[PDB]
Design a protein that fits this description.
3-stranded parallel beta sheet; alpha/beta; binds uridine-5'-diphosphate; globular; binds manganese (II) ion; 8 strands
Length: about 280
Amino acid sequence: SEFELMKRLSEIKVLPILESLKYIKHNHASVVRFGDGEIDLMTGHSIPYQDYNEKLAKRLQQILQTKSDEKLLVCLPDVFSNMDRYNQNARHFWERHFLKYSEFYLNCCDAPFYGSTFISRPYIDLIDKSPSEAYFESLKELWRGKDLLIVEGATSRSGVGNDLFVAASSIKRLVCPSKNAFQYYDEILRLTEKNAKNRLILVMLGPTAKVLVADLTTKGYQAIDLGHIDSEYEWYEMGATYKVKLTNKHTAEFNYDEGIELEFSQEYQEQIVARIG
Ligand SMILES: O=c1ccn([C@@H]2O[C@H](COP(=O)(O)OP(=O)(O)O)[C@@H](O)[C@H]2O)c(=O)[nH]1
Ligand SMILES: [Mn+2]
């Protein structure tokens, strides 16, 4: 029975958002997050913004086997216990997901603990949004007073038009393709390294982000996979109750980057070190 698989899967232990953040800070750890799309890719499917690629799938599988330590926190969706935190559509989505991949989760995810993939998703799927302010405040402490290198796609525009990164000392951006970034992986890694001197690296780049963080970490850098944090922050700032489309940039869960009306932001443009693609 699926019910019995649900119970068995609750053996997986995830540190929820605030606990994950305490871990990252205490340890100055890199962070890689596995979401539903990564599992889809690893098992042979194409996902929003990234076509199936066998080399990518293999790297993702290797990275998932890495133990979490003071250098790197490996994260999973925080859905194996206390699912009642999430709204009905999210609960259904996630249970369907881990039931489909029960064999994957039961067999490949045997570490003593994982961080939360939802460090990038601190608002919209929660029934009780009261803790979200605290979540975002804790997140911001990661980059307060830091020089940042943000590696993201052309539509991501993380922090653009909002105050998410206002307390960062400086921002440089490596702007990559908004879809199929893995095709340019070697160049992305090469230019990230070149520009990372004395910077904290934040990556918003789908499955490619996980490989980048893994490789940067092996080279001794702290790099944090932050995914869709910008969409969540925008929804939080407007007090959104549902996933509303942003007009000026990519929006999480809108899976084709359609209908985007781009603006010219001099400040954003001046932050761009190079474009890849
Ligand atoms: O080839 C790609 C794949 C995705 N992204 C960006 O990656 C971010 C989302 O990353 P992820 O899937 O890790 O987000 P999560 O939902 O797990 O927070 C968004 O800004 C996308 O625009 C990108 O720019 N290029
Ligand atoms: Mn996602």
